[PDB]
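Objective 1b. Sequence-to-structure analysis of PH-interacting protein.
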Amino acid sequence: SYDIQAWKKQCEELLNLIFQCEDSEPFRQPVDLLEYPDYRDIIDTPMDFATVRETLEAGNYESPMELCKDVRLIFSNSKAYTPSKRSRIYSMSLRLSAFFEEHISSVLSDYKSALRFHKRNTIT
Ligand SMILES: C[C@@H](CNC(=O)N1CCN(C(=O)c2cc3sccc3s2)CC1)C(C)(C)C
């Protein structure tokens, strides 16, 4: 497909699959600072899947690369907050990250291919 816009609905569908995964439960809403009062000393830029979905639906992502950067921030925030790399919530982050990366690969490839096809005669 050379459809430059197709990534948006593909990302909506992938978010729907992530929200059905039990492994997304800790990441579906902004972290609670009452639950974790130090969290904001450790994490500079909170991120969660509801914020990603709302940014997509507002039309505030220009490309799937920008969505992918925010989803990867969810996972890096979990790796930087974990006291152990054996811990439950970090362990759920690693499985969810593997599932996300498996599915986002084709979305990025198709988008970047579509942009290249659009510019195939950009100089001419
Ligand atoms: C579910 C809530 C938000 N989410 C939430 O509490 N966390 C998920 C993010 N987070 C981590 O990534 C952690 C990494 C590790 S590994 C061992 C402990 C931890 S905690 C901190 C805790 C709600 C409902 C929105 C209030």
